[PDB]
Amino acid sequence: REDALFDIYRVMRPGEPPTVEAAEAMFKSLFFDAERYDLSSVGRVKMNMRLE
DNA sequence: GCCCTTAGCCCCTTGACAGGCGGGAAACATCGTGTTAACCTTCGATTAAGAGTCGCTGAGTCGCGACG
Incomplete structure (x- = not known):
């Protein structure tokens, strides 16, 4: 991993x-980090719909 | 009709300002320095959902032969 x-x-x-x-x-x-990689809730719901 | 005399215009000589660029002298707003020492000794974006090609690099595959 290093x-x-x-x-x-x-x-x-x-x-x-x-x-x-x-x-x-x-x-x-x-x-x-949620401070920089601020993926909106629409992104998370779209991901949940595309891949369960 | 021509010459003399006098008037008007043009020109010259002086001049009493008026102030007016400009350096100096001065009163006043800049512009480059310093200096102070109480605590943190890796900051951060930004393409990346089209497309024709220039310039370089580094992996796997082969020949030629020598020593058992």
């Missing part, structure tokens, strides 16, 4: 040097 986090950090921010906790925090803030 290698996957490093790869994700390099893909998103190639210039910045990926770190163990920095890469894990980047993915969380990108997708696991």
Whole structure:
């Protein structure tokens, strides 16, 4: 999982040097964080309808 | 009809202002510095639902042969 986090950090921010906790925090803030990945309720309902 | 005399116009000489660009002298609003030391020593967007092609890189497959 550390290698996957490093790869994700390099893909998103190639210039910045990926770190163990920095890469894990980047993915969380990108997708696991509701502050940035603010998917509306219409998106969630559309996902629930498309894939049950 | 021509010459003399006098009047009007044009020109010259002086001048008493009027103020008027402009540097100086001065009173006043800028423009580049400093300086202070009580706490955090990775901030953040933004394509990515069409499309013809230029410029580079790095993987899997083969020949030629040597040493048992």
